[PDB]
Ligand binder design. Structure first.
Ligand SMILES: O=C(O)CNC(=O)C(=O)O
Ligand SMILES: [Mg+2]
Ligand code: NI
Ligand SMILES: [Zn+2]
Length: 331
């Protein structure tokens, strides 16, 4: 078995290897990359997502989210308070202000220490989940707005035509902006490109050990667990590496820099934080190997997780027994 310790693997495709996205994902899996839950892909040196980032300041962040924490430094939840709209140029200025800017630090490890020590005492503002793309239309390789759609994959594998669409999302971050422990909707893959700015640190649990993370989360967040049998779908809970290590949960960490892709694999729990002002683009995707994960994915039916239009068909076709109850949660 390849990669039996479930280490995060880093890939360096040539420009030739970067032509066929599906083929490269299947290659990475042949080497065991999915066992980690997360892989890094450094694009060939010849490739670029677009010519410059000089003209992005007028993008609107319609609903910036202030991420307010509750709990203790290593075990906390966050809620998202909606803020007034602002442009990307306005948000960048805010991120660079004395109140929100990255503190002085020695290296990524020192910054990680400072994040876990101090995150809960601040409420950074995240421009998350903005439909759109920063890939030039002429970028032909690994253009996250030109991928094969999940509805087309389900149709190709299973023969059933379904409604829905699959488009990318932009994320504008600042110091301490945080993504809570989660897997993707329907335990899909994700791919994330860091277009510009400061790094993003990731934590990930191997898919084969995901239920260990779930059991610890039920212990650490006991009221939330009673409320919902899949409360990590709410995307609000944080657990630090120190707490994970104290409780024997297998995980790995890596820092993504501008110009790099990350792929998350089906049922790979992940969480992380931004180092400073940045912009990322991400989208879900599927392969044949996903189908079985989609059939077994947990679901929130308490009503909190509230997701996209396109998840309906996935539930309806892959999980017809759950459909009724899940849809009650969505309506
Ligand atoms: O970058 C972020 O805030 C969160 N992104 C992801 O969870 C992802 O790409 O799957
Ligand atoms: Mg603009
Ligand atoms: Ni994710
Ligand atoms: Zn729920």
């Amino acid at each position: 078995a390849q990669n039996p310790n479930c280490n995060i693997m880093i890939f360096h495709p040539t420009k030739e290897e970067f032509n066929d996205f599906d083929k490269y994902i299947a290659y990475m899996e042949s080497q065991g990359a999915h066992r980690a839950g997360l892989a890094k892909i450094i694009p060939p040196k010849e490739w670029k997502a677009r010519e410059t980032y000089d003209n992005i300041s007028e993008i609107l962040i319609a609903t910036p989210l202030q991420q307010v924490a509750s709990g203790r430094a290593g075990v906390f939840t966050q809620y998202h308070k909606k803020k007034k709209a602002m442009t990307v140029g306005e948000y960048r200025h805010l991120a660079n202000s004395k109140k929100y800017q990255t503190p002085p630090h020695q290296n990524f490890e020192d910054l990680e220490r400072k994040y876990w020590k101090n995150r809960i005492y601040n409420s950074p503002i995240y421009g998350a989940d903005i439909s759109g793309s920063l890939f030039d239309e002429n970028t032909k390789q690994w253009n996250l707005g030109h991928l094969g759609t999940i509805q087309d994959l389900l149709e190709k594998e299973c023969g059933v035509v379904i409604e829905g669409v699959n488009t990318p999302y932009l994320y504008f971050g600042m110091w301490k902006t945080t993504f809570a422990w989660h897997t993707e909707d329907m335990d899909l893959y994700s791919i994330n490109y860091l277009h510009l700015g400061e790094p993003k640190t990731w934590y990930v649990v191997p898919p084969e050990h995901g239920q260990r993370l779930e059991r610890l989360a039920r212990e650490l967040f006991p009221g939330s667990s009673r409320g919902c049998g899949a409360f990590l779908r709410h995307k609000v809970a944080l657990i630090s590496p120190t707490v994970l290590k104290e409780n024997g949960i297998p995980f790995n960490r890596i820092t993504q820099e501008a110009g790099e892709f990350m792929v998350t694999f089906p049922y790979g729990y992940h969480a992380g934080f931004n180092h400073g002002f940045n912009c990322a683009e991400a989208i879900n995707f599927a392969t044949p190997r996903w189908i079985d994960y989609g059939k077994m994915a947990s679901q929130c039916s308490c009503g909190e997780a509230r997701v996209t239009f396109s998840m309906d068909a996935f539930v309806r076709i892959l999980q017809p027994e759950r459909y009724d109850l899940w849809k009650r949660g969505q309506d």
